[PDB]
Amino acid sequence: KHYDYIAIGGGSGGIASINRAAMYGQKCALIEAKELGGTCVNVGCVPKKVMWHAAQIREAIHMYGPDYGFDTTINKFNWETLIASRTAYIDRIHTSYENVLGKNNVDVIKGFARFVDAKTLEVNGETITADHILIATGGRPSHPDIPGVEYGIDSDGFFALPALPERVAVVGAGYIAVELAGVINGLGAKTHLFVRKHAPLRSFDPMISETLVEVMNAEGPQLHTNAIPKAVVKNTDGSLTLELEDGRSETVDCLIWAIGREPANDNINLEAAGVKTNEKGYIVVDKYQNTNIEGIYAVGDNTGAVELTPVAVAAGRRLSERLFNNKPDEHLDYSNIPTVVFSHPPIGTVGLTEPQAREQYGDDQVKVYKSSFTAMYTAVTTHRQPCRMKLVCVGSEEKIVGIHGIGFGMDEMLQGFAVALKMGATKKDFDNTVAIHPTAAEEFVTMR
Amino acid sequence: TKHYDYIAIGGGSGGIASINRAAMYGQKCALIEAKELGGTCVNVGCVPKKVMWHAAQIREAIHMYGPDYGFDTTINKFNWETLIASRTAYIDRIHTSYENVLGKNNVDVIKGFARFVDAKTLEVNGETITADHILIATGGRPSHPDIPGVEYGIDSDGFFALPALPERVAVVGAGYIAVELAGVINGLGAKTHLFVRKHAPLRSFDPMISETLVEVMNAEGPQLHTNAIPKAVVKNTDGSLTLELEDGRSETVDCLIWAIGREPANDNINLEAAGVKTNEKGYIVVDKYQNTNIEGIYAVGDNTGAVELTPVAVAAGRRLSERLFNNKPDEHLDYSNIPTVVFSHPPIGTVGLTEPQAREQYGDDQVKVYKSSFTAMYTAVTTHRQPCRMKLVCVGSEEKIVGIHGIGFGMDEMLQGFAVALKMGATKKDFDNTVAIHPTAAEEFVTMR
Ligand SMILES: Cc1cc2nc3c(=O)[nH]c(=O)nc-3n(C[C@H](O)[C@H](O)[C@H](O)COP(=O)(O)OP(=O)(O)OC[C@H]3O[C@@H](n4cnc5c(N)ncnc54)[C@H](O)[C@@H]3O)c2cc1C
Ligand SMILES: Cc1cc2nc3c(=O)[nH]c(=O)nc-3n(C[C@H](O)[C@H](O)[C@H](O)COP(=O)(O)OP(=O)(O)OC[C@H]3O[C@@H](n4cnc5c(N)ncnc54)[C@H](O)[C@@H]3O)c2cc1C
Ligand SMILES: NC(=O)c1ccc[n+]([C@@H]2O[C@H](COP(=O)([O-])OP(=O)(O)OC[C@H]3O[C@@H](n4cnc5c(N)ncnc54)[C@H](OP(=O)(O)O)[C@@H]3O)[C@@H](O)[C@H]2O)c1
Ligand SMILES: NC(=O)c1ccc[n+]([C@@H]2O[C@H](COP(=O)([O-])OP(=O)(O)OC[C@H]3O[C@@H](n4cnc5c(N)ncnc54)[C@H](OP(=O)(O)O)[C@@H]3O)[C@@H](O)[C@H]2O)c1
């Protein structure tokens, strides 16, 4: 069959790009092997946030609630009810996505696709061809090459757990490790986080990882630093012992690898299309998402860019705008992309860290504003939690180049401040907006 | 007679902020407060109100959402005395740090009701004190209806002194405080009733907000009674009160809260002697720079009839001390586009014009509205799903954003940044060019279609 545009992968980039293109008169087909929505709807963003919410509820009941007057008994935590509720929600999401593509006249082909040549793909026996092909195949979890690695599960295995384990070890030191560790500890399991060096999120502003370690030390997960995994030993009773290179070891009932992800560009026969990947397996793309072959583009996690659903969506829309809506210089700007980590407490960050700004502009040009305070929600309890916020400003005008914060509210408050950052806000612009009281967000417009 | 360079009457929000900024620049100051430092905000407003909103968030987490996330929970006892004790200890620690800052700033705090003897002289506790500049930041107080039985009702100060949570509560009113108190008492488990005189509460807010707020009320409390004009409150033999309404309906409850407005506390300080003019409602009349008609007397805050928010008092007070004492002759607060959050259920966030106001002011042909409605994710996996509804109001070819309105979980915290953007003159294009943050409720304003 012949289509004007085919996207391989019904994850964030594929779906976004094919719907914008179907809007401009194009005949499109989306191909997906597993479920619509990709990592984000199925084993990523949506199910992670439901599980963050379950943890926040258990913490209100068990940690904070007592000091607010509530003497409560959790009679039963039914893991089955929670997973049946998250699954029903995701099934409603699948049906919505189906309806949108249907409205758009996109032909959805369920099956695994592989290249025959630069303009042809084989899917379920059938051959389909198109003048433009988007590869948006995403990624998959990495696993250390050590003895016993197959005893651990990864973040996809986390979403399939039949019950909450008593003792869990999470290995890794980036976003996924920090969030899964935080959720699982929040839901009651004895939780350990093993990181290789001094702290998790070592690339984030120093304030953020220094504060996360503080919270961890007060309320869990138990953090272990300088921890290089050597081997996992399954024991007689069925538990696992993670052995570390320095001699330390820990026995758990479950071990989750959260050590990075890797592109899923391999069994699709790129060689036949002539598309080049780099040393790490990512499809190499330019500014405009073009591969080296004319007529083939890539967006998303499979290109090595920052792995976030909104980046994949925005690059994918702009791509269909360039191609099918005659906007030749249209493309995504990958700087000042806002991030929120759903840790305990949430992290919100956009723009440069203070080390980055002091390297790029020099100490003499950088002015930093910091605020540290107890989140009000916790201030009336014996489990008080810091909130810490930082503005990084450059030049006499104190143009704002990075906004960082960690504490309750960082999740919802960051977006509007990113718009502001994008417009070129200065300290004065923040300062001349009237605060909203009582909120945490108002601390960014009243820093002194 | 001691003479000061600056004296504030009122140690609430405008008074503490203006006096501290003045002391920073070398002025010898005195703050006069008749009751407790921090005023309405710290003691019977902002701070205890949010502590009580969090306690409602917690009971609703245990009782309403918890079950569908699999937590089978039993509240063995809800101890009101513990909650009130933690709330009070937090307000005492706040009194202590204000005294700490005023003390570092060498401000003389005098405790007592002050009254003007003439334009430059004040009497407080038998002593006469004089100053070159005087700030009147006296605030306001609850208004009460003029109907038989009014004294059986309490108001918002009384709500913060309740010795226990009543089983049946009536809240009468349709503003911020009635919507807040009524959703808190309802969230805390009491059979709650809201009585409004016309068709909906918050009738001055964008219609989408009052419309959605009624939807939620009908689905999960408080029980809302529209077209309700109070006629009388009967104290009954068994202790309960019966609110009777003009059209004949009545309701028996154990506690009734008047939340019908506030009025300025400008009347007992002998303004006549100083010569200060007030308006027909009793507010002190001020210009753009917080000046009264008497040279060297200024007022900020709720006693001026400007929008009654703690940050507006604080910002006008701080900027007034910049103008008088730090050489910025044109320093003044711009009262437009001031952001508000109502801590209702769900929160409301709003800034700029409503859709009716933008269509009146710019004409229908110039106004473009974007809307978005979804279920809040926290609730979408439960059998108690709540809407989130968001609106952007734009004008002209450029689609300059003149209003941002929303009601839904996350509106309390997400609004501050967007208000900085509106202030900067953002258009829809600028919102659309920022990369969303997923999964949040906030991202909806940058992906609106
Ligand atoms: C645990 C976890 C948490 C995350 N949380 C967040 C978060 O809260 N916020 C955030 O912004 N980001 C989050 N992310 C990242 C986010 O999920 C990704 O950045 C995003 O999904 C990338 O979109 P994509 O289109 O590149 O790939 P994906 O969504 O991974 O989609 C790729 C799709 O292609 C399909 N496919 C692959 N090859 C073929 C083929 N040859 N034929 C047919 N079908 C094929 C796959 O089945 C899959 O559905 C998270 C990731 C993980 C794993
Ligand atoms: C229930 C409730 C909830 C609220 N919630 C919020 C909210 O969340 N966010 C928000 O921004 N706003 C809120 N507000 C409004 C806010 O509290 C007021 O806008 C704010 O406190 C006004 O500050 P002010 O300095 O004008 O006066 P006030 O805080 O009222 O203080 C004036 C002070 O003057 C003192 N006084 C009066 N006359 C004299 C005298 N002659 N001599 C000496 N002392 C005197 C009084 O004792 C008082 O301490 C709320 C109000 C209420 C009642
Ligand atoms: N809410 C969100 O925005 C969100 C949430 C989750 C994921 N995502 C995205 O998905 C991307 C990939 O996720 P990820 O967190 O798995 O990868 P990641 O961010 O690259 O973090 C993995 C980290 O684990 C450590 N590590 C690597 N090998 C290790 C090993 N052998 N043993 C122990 N530790 C090892 C490294 O840190 P050290 O060098 O310090 O050891 C590495 O930086 C993220 O970068 C993010 O963009 C987004
Ligand atoms: N979010 C915040 O920052 C916050 C929170 C709380 C309070 N505050 C401030 O404090 C101020 C005062 O709040 P408020 O709620 O007390 O007053 P309000 O906002 O003026 O609202 C009271 C409403 O009560 C109704 N009403 C008046 N007389 C009535 C009567 N006799 N019987 C029944 N209903 C009657 C009127 O609405 P109808 O005409 O529709 O009946 C009136 O608009 C607010 O304006 C606000 O600025 C701020």
Side-chain angles (χ1 to χ4, degrees), chain B residues 182-218:
Chain B
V184 165
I185 286 154
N186 185 71
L188 275 186
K191 300 53 165 279
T192 308
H193 301 256
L194 185 50
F195 291 88
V196 297
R197 295 183 311 180
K198 280 171 164 173
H199 66 102
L202 252 42
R203 290 160 55 237
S204 56
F205 279 49
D206 185 281
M208 176 195 83
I209 295 191
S210 59
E211 273 187 64
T212 301
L213 189 64
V214 176
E215 269 186 50
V216 174
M217 271 175 181
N218 293 13

mmCIF file of all heavy atoms in Angstrom, chain B residues 182-218:
data_model
loop_
_atom_site.group_PDB
_atom_site.id
_atom_site.type_symbol
_atom_site.label_atom_id
_atom_site.label_comp_id
_atom_site.label_asym_id
_atom_site.label_seq_id
_atom_site.Cartn_x
_atom_site.Cartn_y
_atom_site.Cartn_z
ATOM 1 N N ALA B 182 -16.558 26.427 53.985
ATOM 2 C CA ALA B 182 -17.499 25.396 53.711
ATOM 3 C C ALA B 182 -16.814 24.162 53.114
ATOM 4 O O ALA B 182 -17.171 23.049 53.525
ATOM 5 C CB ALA B 182 -18.537 25.827 52.730
ATOM 6 N N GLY B 183 -15.852 24.253 52.169
ATOM 7 C CA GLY B 183 -15.197 23.038 51.640
ATOM 8 C C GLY B 183 -14.274 22.413 52.666
ATOM 9 O O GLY B 183 -14.150 21.178 52.651
ATOM 10 N N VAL B 184 -13.581 23.166 53.544
ATOM 11 C CA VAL B 184 -12.805 22.624 54.638
ATOM 12 C C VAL B 184 -13.681 21.861 55.616
ATOM 13 O O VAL B 184 -13.366 20.703 55.917
ATOM 14 C CB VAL B 184 -12.098 23.783 55.336
ATOM 15 C CG1 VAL B 184 -11.556 23.427 56.669
ATOM 16 C CG2 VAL B 184 -10.858 24.132 54.507
ATOM 17 N N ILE B 185 -14.804 22.433 56.106
ATOM 18 C CA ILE B 185 -15.656 21.763 57.095
ATOM 19 C C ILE B 185 -16.269 20.522 56.470
ATOM 20 O O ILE B 185 -16.225 19.457 57.107
ATOM 21 C CB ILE B 185 -16.716 22.811 57.590
ATOM 22 C CG1 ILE B 185 -16.057 23.840 58.535
ATOM 23 C CG2 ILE B 185 -17.808 22.131 58.407
ATOM 24 C CD1 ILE B 185 -16.917 25.103 58.402
ATOM 25 N N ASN B 186 -16.698 20.607 55.194
ATOM 26 C CA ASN B 186 -17.197 19.476 54.478
ATOM 27 C C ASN B 186 -16.102 18.431 54.373
ATOM 28 O O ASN B 186 -16.343 17.296 54.775
ATOM 29 C CB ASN B 186 -17.604 19.883 53.137
ATOM 30 C CG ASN B 186 -18.255 18.737 52.390
ATOM 31 O OD1 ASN B 186 -19.376 18.313 52.683
ATOM 32 N ND2 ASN B 186 -17.637 18.244 51.330
ATOM 33 N N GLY B 187 -14.873 18.769 53.968
ATOM 34 C CA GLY B 187 -13.782 17.811 53.862
ATOM 35 C C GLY B 187 -13.438 17.164 55.187
ATOM 36 O O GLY B 187 -13.016 15.994 55.262
ATOM 37 N N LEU B 188 -13.626 17.907 56.267
ATOM 38 C CA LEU B 188 -13.324 17.343 57.554
ATOM 39 C C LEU B 188 -14.418 16.436 58.110
ATOM 40 O O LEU B 188 -14.271 15.913 59.202
ATOM 41 C CB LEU B 188 -12.997 18.473 58.500
ATOM 42 C CG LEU B 188 -11.562 18.959 58.468
ATOM 43 C CD1 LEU B 188 -11.391 19.982 59.572
ATOM 44 C CD2 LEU B 188 -10.571 17.813 58.736
ATOM 45 N N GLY B 189 -15.490 16.207 57.381
ATOM 46 C CA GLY B 189 -16.499 15.247 57.754
ATOM 47 C C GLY B 189 -17.797 15.826 58.320
ATOM 48 O O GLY B 189 -18.677 15.036 58.666
ATOM 49 N N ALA B 190 -18.028 17.132 58.448
ATOM 50 C CA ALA B 190 -19.290 17.601 59.025
ATOM 51 C C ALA B 190 -20.383 17.686 57.975
ATOM 52 O O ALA B 190 -20.033 17.887 56.793
ATOM 53 C CB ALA B 190 -19.032 18.943 59.653
ATOM 54 N N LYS B 191 -21.690 17.499 58.264
ATOM 55 C CA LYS B 191 -22.757 17.712 57.272
ATOM 56 C C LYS B 191 -22.756 19.237 57.109
ATOM 57 O O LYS B 191 -23.065 19.975 58.059
ATOM 58 C CB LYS B 191 -24.208 17.346 57.728
ATOM 59 C CG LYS B 191 -24.611 15.925 58.183
ATOM 60 C CD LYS B 191 -23.682 15.418 59.297
ATOM 61 C CE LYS B 191 -24.105 14.199 60.111
ATOM 62 N NZ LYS B 191 -25.039 14.558 61.163
ATOM 63 N N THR B 192 -22.402 19.717 55.928
ATOM 64 C CA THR B 192 -22.178 21.131 55.679
ATOM 65 C C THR B 192 -23.161 21.693 54.670
ATOM 66 O O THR B 192 -23.596 21.025 53.715
ATOM 67 C CB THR B 192 -20.736 21.296 55.194
ATOM 68 O OG1 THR B 192 -19.913 20.643 56.160
ATOM 69 C CG2 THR B 192 -20.302 22.761 55.078
ATOM 70 N N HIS B 193 -23.592 22.932 54.876
ATOM 71 C CA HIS B 193 -24.535 23.528 53.950
ATOM 72 C C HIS B 193 -23.994 24.887 53.613
ATOM 73 O O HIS B 193 -23.506 25.584 54.516
ATOM 74 C CB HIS B 193 -25.965 23.700 54.566
ATOM 75 C CG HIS B 193 -26.643 22.425 55.038
ATOM 76 N ND1 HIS B 193 -27.628 21.685 54.493
ATOM 77 C CD2 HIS B 193 -26.273 21.852 56.219
ATOM 78 C CE1 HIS B 193 -27.848 20.708 55.318
ATOM 79 N NE2 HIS B 193 -27.039 20.819 56.340
ATOM 80 N N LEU B 194 -24.072 25.271 52.347
ATOM 81 C CA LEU B 194 -23.627 26.590 51.912
ATOM 82 C C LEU B 194 -24.881 27.331 51.476
ATOM 83 O O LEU B 194 -25.672 26.769 50.706
ATOM 84 C CB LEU B 194 -22.654 26.507 50.703
ATOM 85 C CG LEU B 194 -22.004 27.774 50.208
ATOM 86 C CD1 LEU B 194 -21.391 28.503 51.393
ATOM 87 C CD2 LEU B 194 -20.887 27.469 49.225
ATOM 88 N N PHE B 195 -25.119 28.570 51.911
ATOM 89 C CA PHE B 195 -26.317 29.286 51.464
ATOM 90 C C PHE B 195 -25.862 30.496 50.707
ATOM 91 O O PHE B 195 -25.117 31.316 51.256
ATOM 92 C CB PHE B 195 -27.201 29.755 52.655
ATOM 93 C CG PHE B 195 -27.884 28.624 53.410
ATOM 94 C CD1 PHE B 195 -27.229 28.011 54.440
ATOM 95 C CD2 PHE B 195 -29.127 28.186 53.033
ATOM 96 C CE1 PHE B 195 -27.812 26.941 55.096
ATOM 97 C CE2 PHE B 195 -29.698 27.122 53.688
ATOM 98 C CZ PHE B 195 -29.040 26.502 54.711
ATOM 99 N N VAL B 196 -26.319 30.638 49.467
ATOM 100 C CA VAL B 196 -25.905 31.802 48.691
ATOM 101 C C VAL B 196 -27.162 32.542 48.287
ATOM 102 O O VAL B 196 -28.209 31.904 48.112
ATOM 103 C CB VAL B 196 -25.034 31.391 47.399
ATOM 104 C CG1 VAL B 196 -23.792 30.728 47.949
ATOM 105 C CG2 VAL B 196 -25.750 30.524 46.389
ATOM 106 N N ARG B 197 -27.090 33.871 48.126
ATOM 107 C CA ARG B 197 -28.291 34.623 47.805
ATOM 108 C C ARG B 197 -28.724 34.473 46.385
ATOM 109 O O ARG B 197 -29.926 34.358 46.138
ATOM 110 C CB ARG B 197 -28.112 36.105 48.083
ATOM 111 C CG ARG B 197 -27.926 36.319 49.596
ATOM 112 C CD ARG B 197 -27.797 37.797 50.021
ATOM 113 N NE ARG B 197 -26.828 38.494 49.190
ATOM 114 C CZ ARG B 197 -26.541 39.790 49.362
ATOM 115 N NH1 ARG B 197 -27.099 40.475 50.340
ATOM 116 N NH2 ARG B 197 -25.657 40.416 48.587
ATOM 117 N N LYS B 198 -27.826 34.453 45.394
ATOM 118 C CA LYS B 198 -28.273 34.255 44.021
ATOM 119 C C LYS B 198 -28.061 32.829 43.532
ATOM 120 O O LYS B 198 -28.315 31.862 44.253
ATOM 121 C CB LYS B 198 -27.560 35.312 43.164
ATOM 122 C CG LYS B 198 -28.372 36.553 43.406
ATOM 123 C CD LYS B 198 -27.779 37.806 42.842
ATOM 124 C CE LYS B 198 -28.929 38.815 42.832
ATOM 125 N NZ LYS B 198 -28.500 40.154 42.453
ATOM 126 N N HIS B 199 -27.566 32.662 42.311
ATOM 127 C CA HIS B 199 -27.504 31.368 41.632
ATOM 128 C C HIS B 199 -26.271 30.546 41.908
ATOM 129 O O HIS B 199 -26.286 29.363 41.642
ATOM 130 C CB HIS B 199 -27.597 31.567 40.106
ATOM 131 C CG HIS B 199 -26.376 32.313 39.516
ATOM 132 N ND1 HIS B 199 -25.334 31.802 38.854
ATOM 133 C CD2 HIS B 199 -26.156 33.679 39.597
ATOM 134 C CE1 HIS B 199 -24.517 32.781 38.543
ATOM 135 N NE2 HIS B 199 -25.020 33.907 38.995
ATOM 136 N N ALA B 200 -25.179 31.123 42.362
ATOM 137 C CA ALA B 200 -23.936 30.404 42.526
ATOM 138 C C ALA B 200 -23.091 31.246 43.445
ATOM 139 O O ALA B 200 -23.410 32.439 43.672
ATOM 140 C CB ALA B 200 -23.188 30.270 41.223
ATOM 141 N N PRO B 201 -22.087 30.647 44.082
ATOM 142 C CA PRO B 201 -21.086 31.370 44.819
ATOM 143 C C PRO B 201 -20.112 31.982 43.817
ATOM 144 O O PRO B 201 -20.212 31.678 42.620
ATOM 145 C CB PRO B 201 -20.477 30.350 45.712
ATOM 146 C CG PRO B 201 -20.634 29.063 44.945
ATOM 147 C CD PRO B 201 -21.941 29.184 44.254
ATOM 148 N N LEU B 202 -19.268 32.915 44.274
ATOM 149 C CA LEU B 202 -18.182 33.495 43.479
ATOM 150 C C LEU B 202 -18.674 34.061 42.138
ATOM 151 O O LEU B 202 -18.056 33.963 41.068
ATOM 152 C CB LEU B 202 -17.136 32.354 43.364
ATOM 153 C CG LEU B 202 -15.789 32.364 44.101
ATOM 154 C CD1 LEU B 202 -15.837 32.844 45.507
ATOM 155 C CD2 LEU B 202 -15.326 30.937 44.191
ATOM 156 N N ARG B 203 -19.783 34.807 42.204
ATOM 157 C CA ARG B 203 -20.412 35.305 40.997
ATOM 158 C C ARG B 203 -19.564 36.337 40.270
ATOM 159 O O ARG B 203 -19.814 36.620 39.102
ATOM 160 C CB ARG B 203 -21.758 35.900 41.360
ATOM 161 C CG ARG B 203 -22.860 34.952 41.786
ATOM 162 C CD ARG B 203 -23.874 35.770 42.554
ATOM 163 N NE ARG B 203 -24.363 36.901 41.798
ATOM 164 C CZ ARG B 203 -24.286 38.184 42.194
ATOM 165 N NH1 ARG B 203 -23.768 38.560 43.358
ATOM 166 N NH2 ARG B 203 -24.764 39.129 41.377
ATOM 167 N N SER B 204 -18.547 36.919 40.892
ATOM 168 C CA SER B 204 -17.695 37.872 40.211
ATOM 169 C C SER B 204 -16.532 37.199 39.467
ATOM 170 O O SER B 204 -15.876 37.898 38.679
ATOM 171 C CB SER B 204 -17.115 38.854 41.213
ATOM 172 O OG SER B 204 -16.425 38.142 42.231
ATOM 173 N N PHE B 205 -16.248 35.898 39.739
ATOM 174 C CA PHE B 205 -15.186 35.164 39.087
ATOM 175 C C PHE B 205 -15.624 34.755 37.685
ATOM 176 O O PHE B 205 -16.819 34.876 37.350
ATOM 177 C CB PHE B 205 -14.821 33.916 39.915
ATOM 178 C CG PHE B 205 -13.893 34.245 41.086
ATOM 179 C CD1 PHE B 205 -14.166 35.299 41.955
ATOM 180 C CD2 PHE B 205 -12.744 33.499 41.299
ATOM 181 C CE1 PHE B 205 -13.302 35.580 43.002
ATOM 182 C CE2 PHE B 205 -11.890 33.793 42.350
ATOM 183 C CZ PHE B 205 -12.156 34.835 43.211
ATOM 184 N N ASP B 206 -14.711 34.286 36.819
ATOM 185 C CA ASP B 206 -15.124 33.898 35.475
ATOM 186 C C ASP B 206 -16.240 32.861 35.594
ATOM 187 O O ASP B 206 -16.185 31.984 36.479
ATOM 188 C CB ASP B 206 -13.884 33.323 34.703
ATOM 189 C CG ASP B 206 -14.193 33.007 33.240
ATOM 190 O OD1 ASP B 206 -14.788 31.964 32.955
ATOM 191 O OD2 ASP B 206 -13.892 33.835 32.384
ATOM 192 N N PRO B 207 -17.256 32.864 34.740
ATOM 193 C CA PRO B 207 -18.397 31.991 34.875
ATOM 194 C C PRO B 207 -18.011 30.516 34.932
ATOM 195 O O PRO B 207 -18.630 29.759 35.682
ATOM 196 C CB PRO B 207 -19.264 32.306 33.706
ATOM 197 C CG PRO B 207 -18.889 33.732 33.399
ATOM 198 C CD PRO B 207 -17.390 33.684 33.555
ATOM 199 N N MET B 208 -16.944 30.122 34.233
ATOM 200 C CA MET B 208 -16.470 28.741 34.235
ATOM 201 C C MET B 208 -16.142 28.241 35.627
ATOM 202 O O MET B 208 -16.402 27.093 35.979
ATOM 203 C CB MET B 208 -15.207 28.638 33.321
ATOM 204 C CG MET B 208 -14.506 27.276 33.257
ATOM 205 S SD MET B 208 -12.840 27.396 32.539
ATOM 206 C CE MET B 208 -11.883 27.900 33.944
ATOM 207 N N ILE B 209 -15.514 29.074 36.438
ATOM 208 C CA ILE B 209 -15.133 28.755 37.774
ATOM 209 C C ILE B 209 -16.393 28.569 38.620
ATOM 210 O O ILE B 209 -16.542 27.476 39.188
ATOM 211 C CB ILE B 209 -14.275 29.896 38.235
ATOM 212 C CG1 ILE B 209 -12.992 29.923 37.390
ATOM 213 C CG2 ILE B 209 -13.945 29.755 39.689
ATOM 214 C CD1 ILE B 209 -11.966 30.871 37.950
ATOM 215 N N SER B 210 -17.370 29.514 38.653
ATOM 216 C CA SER B 210 -18.521 29.357 39.549
ATOM 217 C C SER B 210 -19.328 28.167 39.070
ATOM 218 O O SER B 210 -19.782 27.355 39.882
ATOM 219 C CB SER B 210 -19.335 30.643 39.534
ATOM 220 O OG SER B 210 -19.776 30.951 38.230
ATOM 221 N N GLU B 211 -19.403 27.979 37.738
ATOM 222 C CA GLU B 211 -20.050 26.815 37.151
ATOM 223 C C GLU B 211 -19.420 25.487 37.568
ATOM 224 O O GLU B 211 -20.103 24.561 38.032
ATOM 225 C CB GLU B 211 -19.969 26.856 35.702
ATOM 226 C CG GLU B 211 -21.052 27.600 35.023
ATOM 227 C CD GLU B 211 -20.901 27.390 33.524
ATOM 228 O OE1 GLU B 211 -21.044 26.240 33.076
ATOM 229 O OE2 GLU B 211 -20.637 28.376 32.822
ATOM 230 N N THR B 212 -18.100 25.364 37.477
ATOM 231 C CA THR B 212 -17.480 24.125 37.874
ATOM 232 C C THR B 212 -17.643 23.927 39.371
ATOM 233 O O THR B 212 -17.933 22.796 39.803
ATOM 234 C CB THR B 212 -15.975 24.152 37.475
ATOM 235 O OG1 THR B 212 -15.953 24.337 36.054
ATOM 236 C CG2 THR B 212 -15.196 22.863 37.835
ATOM 237 N N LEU B 213 -17.484 24.972 40.185
ATOM 238 C CA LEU B 213 -17.560 24.854 41.649
ATOM 239 C C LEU B 213 -18.926 24.350 42.072
ATOM 240 O O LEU B 213 -19.013 23.452 42.903
ATOM 241 C CB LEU B 213 -17.299 26.197 42.318
ATOM 242 C CG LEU B 213 -17.122 26.239 43.804
ATOM 243 C CD1 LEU B 213 -15.890 25.463 44.264
ATOM 244 C CD2 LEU B 213 -16.978 27.687 44.170
ATOM 245 N N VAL B 214 -20.008 24.815 41.466
ATOM 246 C CA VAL B 214 -21.301 24.199 41.744
ATOM 247 C C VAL B 214 -21.324 22.687 41.402
ATOM 248 O O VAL B 214 -21.911 21.899 42.142
ATOM 249 C CB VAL B 214 -22.380 24.980 40.943
ATOM 250 C CG1 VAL B 214 -23.759 24.371 41.069
ATOM 251 C CG2 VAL B 214 -22.487 26.369 41.533
ATOM 252 N N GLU B 215 -20.711 22.239 40.293
ATOM 253 C CA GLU B 215 -20.681 20.842 39.874
ATOM 254 C C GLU B 215 -20.078 19.986 40.949
ATOM 255 O O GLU B 215 -20.644 18.975 41.372
ATOM 256 C CB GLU B 215 -19.830 20.649 38.661
ATOM 257 C CG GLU B 215 -20.550 20.746 37.361
ATOM 258 C CD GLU B 215 -19.646 20.394 36.173
ATOM 259 O OE1 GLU B 215 -18.974 19.348 36.200
ATOM 260 O OE2 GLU B 215 -19.617 21.189 35.229
ATOM 261 N N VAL B 216 -18.922 20.424 41.444
ATOM 262 C CA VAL B 216 -18.234 19.661 42.463
ATOM 263 C C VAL B 216 -19.121 19.637 43.711
ATOM 264 O O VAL B 216 -19.353 18.551 44.239
ATOM 265 C CB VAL B 216 -16.844 20.302 42.718
ATOM 266 C CG1 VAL B 216 -16.139 19.626 43.879
ATOM 267 C CG2 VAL B 216 -15.950 20.109 41.460
ATOM 268 N N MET B 217 -19.723 20.767 44.127
ATOM 269 C CA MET B 217 -20.531 20.831 45.349
ATOM 270 C C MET B 217 -21.677 19.855 45.290
ATOM 271 O O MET B 217 -21.892 19.054 46.194
ATOM 272 C CB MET B 217 -21.015 22.247 45.529
ATOM 273 C CG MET B 217 -19.947 22.950 46.341
ATOM 274 S SD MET B 217 -20.283 24.728 46.543
ATOM 275 C CE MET B 217 -18.829 25.076 47.461
ATOM 276 N N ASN B 218 -22.336 19.789 44.160
ATOM 277 C CA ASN B 218 -23.429 18.859 43.977
ATOM 278 C C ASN B 218 -22.968 17.421 44.006
ATOM 279 O O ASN B 218 -23.677 16.555 44.508
ATOM 280 C CB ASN B 218 -24.141 19.179 42.650
ATOM 281 C CG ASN B 218 -24.869 20.542 42.669
ATOM 282 O OD1 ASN B 218 -24.710 21.417 43.551
ATOM 283 N ND2 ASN B 218 -25.700 20.773 41.664
#
